Amino acid sequence: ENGYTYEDYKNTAEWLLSHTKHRPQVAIICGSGLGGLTDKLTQAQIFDYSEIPNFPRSTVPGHAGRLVFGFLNGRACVMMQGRFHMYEGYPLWKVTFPVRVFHLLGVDTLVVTNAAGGLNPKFEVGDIMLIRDHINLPGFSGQNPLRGPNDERFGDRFPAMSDAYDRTMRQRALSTWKQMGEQRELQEGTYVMVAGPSFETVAECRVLQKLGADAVGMSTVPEVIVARHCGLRVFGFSLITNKVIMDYESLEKANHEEVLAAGKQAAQKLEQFVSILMASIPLPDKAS
Amino acid sequence: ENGYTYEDYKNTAEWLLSHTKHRPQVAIICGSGLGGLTDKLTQAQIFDYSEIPNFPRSTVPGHAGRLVFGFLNGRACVMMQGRFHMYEGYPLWKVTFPVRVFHLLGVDTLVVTNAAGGLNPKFEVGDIMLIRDHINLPGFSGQNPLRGPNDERFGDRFPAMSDAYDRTMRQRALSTWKQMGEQRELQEGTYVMVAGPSFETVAECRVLQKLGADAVGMSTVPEVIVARHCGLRVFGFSLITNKVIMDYESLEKANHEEVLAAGKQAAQKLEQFVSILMASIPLPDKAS
Amino acid sequence: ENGYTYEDYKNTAEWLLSHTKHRPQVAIICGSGLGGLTDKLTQAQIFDYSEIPNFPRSTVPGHAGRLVFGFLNGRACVMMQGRFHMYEGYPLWKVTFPVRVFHLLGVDTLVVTNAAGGLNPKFEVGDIMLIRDHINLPGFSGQNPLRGPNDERFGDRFPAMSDAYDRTMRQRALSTWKQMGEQRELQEGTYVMVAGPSFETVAECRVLQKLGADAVGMSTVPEVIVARHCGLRVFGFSLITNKVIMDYESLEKANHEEVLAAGKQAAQKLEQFVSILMASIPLPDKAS
Ligand SMILES: O=c1[nH]cnc2c1ncn2[C@H]1CC[C@@H](CO)O1
Ligand SMILES: O=c1[nH]cnc2c1ncn2[C@H]1CC[C@@H](CO)O1
Ligand SMILES: O=c1[nH]cnc2c1ncn2[C@H]1CC[C@@H](CO)O1
Numbered sequence: 103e104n105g106y107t108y109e110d111y112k113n114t115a116e117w118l119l120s121h122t123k124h125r126p127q128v129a130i131i132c133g134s135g136l137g138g139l140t141d142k143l144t145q146a147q148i149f150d151y152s153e154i155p156n157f158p159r160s161t162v163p164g165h166a167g168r169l170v171f172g173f174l175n176g177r178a179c180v181m182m183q184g185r186f187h188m189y190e191g192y193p194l195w196k197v198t199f200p201v202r203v204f205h206l207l208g209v210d211t212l213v214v215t216n217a218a219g220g221l222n223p224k225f226e227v228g229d230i231m232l233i234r235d236h237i238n239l240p241g242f243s244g245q246n247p248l249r250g251p252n253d254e255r256f257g258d259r260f261p262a263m264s265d266a267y268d269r270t271m272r273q274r275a276l277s278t279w280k281q282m283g284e285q286r287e288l289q290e291g292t293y294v295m296v297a298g299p300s301f302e303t304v305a306e307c308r309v310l311q312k313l314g315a316d317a318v319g320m321s322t323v324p325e326v327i328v329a330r331h332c333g334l335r336v337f338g339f340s341l342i343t344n345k346v347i348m349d350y351e352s353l354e355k356a357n358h359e360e361v362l363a364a365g366k367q368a369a370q371k372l373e374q375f376v377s378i379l380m381a382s383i384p385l386p387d388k389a390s
Numbered sequence: 391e392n393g394y395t396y397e398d399y400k401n402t403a404e405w406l407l408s409h410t411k412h413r414p415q416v417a418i419i420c421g422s423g424l425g426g427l428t429d430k431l432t433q434a435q436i437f438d439y440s441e442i443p444n445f446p447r448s449t450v451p452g453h454a455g456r457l458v459f460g461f462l463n464g465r466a467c468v469m470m471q472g473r474f475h476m477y478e479g480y481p482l483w484k485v486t487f488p489v490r491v492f493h494l495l496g497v498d499t500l501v502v503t504n505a506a507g508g509l510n511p512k513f514e515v516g517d518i519m520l521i522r523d524h525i526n527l528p529g530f531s532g533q534n535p536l537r538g539p540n541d542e543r544f545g546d547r548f549p550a551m552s553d554a555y556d557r558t559m560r561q562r563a564l565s566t567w568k569q570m571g572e573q574r575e576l577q578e579g580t581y582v583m584v585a586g587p588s589f590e591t592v593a594e595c596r597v598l599q600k601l602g603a604d605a606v607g608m609s610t611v612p613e614v615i616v617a618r619h620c621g622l623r624v625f626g627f628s629l630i631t632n633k634v635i636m637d638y639e640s641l642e643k644a645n646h647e648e649v650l651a652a653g654k655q656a657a658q659k660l661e662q663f664v665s666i667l668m669a670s671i672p673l674p675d676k677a678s
Numbered sequence: 679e680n681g682y683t684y685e686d687y688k689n690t691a692e693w694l695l696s697h698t699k700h701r702p703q704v705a706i707i708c709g710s711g712l713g714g715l716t717d718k719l720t721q722a723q724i725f726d727y728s729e730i731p732n733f734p735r736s737t738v739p740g741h742a743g744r745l746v747f748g749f750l751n752g753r754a755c756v757m758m759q760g761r762f763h764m765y766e767g768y769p770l771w772k773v774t775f776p777v778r779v780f781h782l783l784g785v786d787t788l789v790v791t792n793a794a795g796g797l798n799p800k801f802e803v804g805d806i807m808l809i810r811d812h813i814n815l816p817g818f819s820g821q822n823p824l825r826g827p828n829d830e831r832f833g834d835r836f837p838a839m840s841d842a843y844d845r846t847m848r849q850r851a852l853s854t855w856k857q858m859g860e861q862r863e864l865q866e867g868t869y870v871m872v873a874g875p876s877f878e879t880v881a882e883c884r885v886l887q888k889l890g891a892d893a894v895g896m897s898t899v900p901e902v903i904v905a906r907h908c909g910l911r912v913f914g915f916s917l918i919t920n921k922v923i924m925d926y927e928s929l930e931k932a933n934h935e936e937v938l939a940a941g942k943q944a945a946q947k948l949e950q951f952v953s954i955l956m957a958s959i960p961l962p963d964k965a966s
Binding site for chain 3: 104235236237238241242243244245246248249250251252258259260261262263264265266292312313314315327330331
């Protein structure tokens with residue numbers, strides 16, 4: 103985990119402990135425009151990234167740069183509003199530092215969210231996709247958050263990712279959606295991480311499509327991965343904010359204004375979802 | 391753009407201004423063996439990379455390591471003879487530093503050239519290919535020149551690349567070729583950037599082929615990308631210097647001696663082309 | 679070769695010379711659990727990585743962290759028990775430093791081994807695969823050991839990899855296997871390097887499969903590549919330690935305990951193989 107040491111994590115976890123009365127169980131990292139979830143907490147105790155000991159700040163635009171503590175629909179969460187991306191300069195051991203601290207803080211579940219582009223045509227903007235799998239492109243080329251000496255206090259050298267996106271939690275998600283009897287089904291498919299801040303070209307989109315991806319994005323994977331390394335339960339969704347183009351002869355392209363998505367009903371649609379889903383995450387009590 | 395600051399760009403742009411009387415409009419970055427284009431300028435004022443304030447030098451072999459100023463077939467260009475490649479150690483924010491300076495210098499068009507390998511069988515060495523699209527392999531894994539804090543004085547955080555290789559300029563190129571009624575057509579296809587200085591293996595070539603690439607090379611993309619980020623018009627060609635191999639049972643491989651291509655008629659064929667094409671790049675006057 | 683200089687290599691080669699009487703011809707780099715080969719040497723003179731001048735140490739767990747010198751089945755080898763991987767923090771110019779020193783030491787052949795995952799279904803664990811080709815994933819994204827200024831004292835700027843895994847030595851391997859009339863054939867196929875220490879997901883495995891890979895692993899390529907750059911003869915095998923998963927609905931995943939493979943007969947099976955194969959590597963005498 104180059105950069106930080108165990109004790110850096112300990113010292114930050116502890117600092118958090120002795121500065122909040124909350125002992126979170128589920129850590130939620132909100133993607134673009136889905137940070138409204140913070141609103142729904144209770145007994146909320148906000149923490150500015152910067153105020154915490156070794157916490158990677160979030161540049162100057164880190165307006166939504168805070169770690170909120172509270173209770174949501176039954177569980178004592180800890181939310182990350184506004185995360186770190188590879189594309190902004192953060193080496194991956196800064197991007198994923200939270201996940202290690204959430205672990206030592208006591209977390210045992212991580213529900214990671216993000217807005218992503220739509221590659222699967224069956225997807226339509228506004229859609230919500232269940233990450234059943236991911237393709238760690240940067241990781242293939244060495245951009246893996248576990249590069250460097252491994253700490254057997256955190257996990258194994260070679261953790262398997264075959265499993266990562268918890269199966270049961272996916273049943274429960276498919277099901278909770280149906281319970282809400284929602285208009286439009288809870289999409290499910292493979293999520294592909296691509297770093298670059300620029301948006302995919304039509305030649306790029308096509309390789310991802312053949313590659314098996316369904317939604318493309320620029321984060322999540324580093325947090326998914328290091329969480330699993332820790333032994334955290336993991337599941338997540340993607341807010342399809344825009345359909346990804348294809349050559350032939352187009353007329354559109356892709357813009358961030360499409361973030362209107364991340365804020366429109368869609369946003370707060372996933373928020374209700376994520377809220378109700380708190381009721382389907384097992385307690386540490388090993389419930390019986 | 392880690393490494394340099396806005397003012398580093400300003401200070402270099404200005405230095406260039408107050409050291410040349412030329413206010414270039416089109417910046418041309420010449421690939422291997424196609425640097426003969428410099429010959430054709432007029433009112434040529436050569437500048438040694440090294441003499442310019444923050445300009446990345448080009449090692450010791452930077453013989454063809456200069457930025458020539460002048461007029462070509464009607465426009466006041468600024469040419470880069472001998473560029474920087476990832477494979478020689480340059481972090482991408484040094485490779486692409488010129489494109490930012492050409493921008494502040496006033497440029498509004500960039501015609502980037504390179505020699506590339508032939509993947510599409512329809513290609514035959516000597517051929518010239520029109521880059522209609524590109525696959526930014528390094529970029530997928532984080533090797534994107536826009537990594538780091540974004541400067542809204544240069545462009546947007548998430549620029550789309552869906553478009554990059556200007557459409558009209560491609561009509562004009564296909565057309566100008568036909569105007570010259572040239573022997574052999576102006577190929578067009580997708581260009582794939584691969585970093586490594588070594589040459590592709592037969593297992594590698596095959597993945598690129600299925601991946602959609604037509605020509606493979608080791609540059610251009612970083613300059614294409616940062617140009618678009620700036621709002622520069624962009625179009626380019628590749629000089630197929632050698633056909634890329636495929637398993638089965640071969641007898642050849644790939645060598646740099648194949649640069650004979652980059653210097654043979656082919657070279658100066660693209661040079662006449664690029665020269666005449668100056669007549670088809672719109673003026674800043676918004677011509678009417 | 680950023681990091682070290684020619685003289686760093688010279689100073690280490692020489693140090694090795696004036697500290698051993700052995701002038702090795704074949705350098706063997708043993709993969710996981712196949713380091714038992716060291717046992718079979720004779721006139722063995724062990725050297726602790728750390729004791730050698732610029733030699734990258736191997737962390738604290740570098741127990742099997744030594745460079746053994748001796749004679750094996752006829753040739754004066756030099757073996758690397760326990761290599762360096764990208765995933766442990768080593769920049770590739772440290773990972774591959776040995777290959778440069780083995781070169782200056784006089785080596786002219788490198789037989790590299792590794793344990794790898796099975797992607798080709800025809801593969802069955804325990805199997806041994808002949809690396810006929812490789813797909814340098816990290817290399818595509820810039821992770822190539824030849825990045826930086828090139829030393830024409832070592833090799834060419836753009837070395838071709840079209841060839842790398844010596845053809846004749848493969849005939850001899852297929853043949854020697856048949857000579858032993860072994861139970862189970864000497865598999866042959868394409869080896870794909872993936873960096874990350876974590877194990878491939880089912881979405882990842884599928885892209886590698888379509889990509890053409892047969893076995894997947896996390897090393898070898900950097901050593902294969904820099905060897906060829908030097909002009910070393912190269913050939914290698916992979917010990918399929920585990921079959922790689924695929925979605926649908928599985929029940930297994932991948933664990934390091936599967937290293938039981940690397941140590942079981944399989945291990946010492948490749949060891950006899952590699953030993954007998956010493957008899958099929960040409961001598962520097964240009965035998966006649
Ligand atoms: O089509 C897409 N490709 C890649 N990343 C995407 C796409 N759509 C959304 N994002 C992610 C990456 C950054 C942020 C911008 O809103 O959202
Ligand atoms: O087949 C090829 N693959 C990759 N790069 C290539 C190929 N052909 C040319 N170049 C580019 C990369 C470096 C320079 C050497 O002349 O030209
Ligand atoms: O399925 C696999 N995928 C990637 N690397 C693998 C696989 N199997 C073995 N290794 C390599 C990488 C590290 C070491 C762990 O024993 O062996």
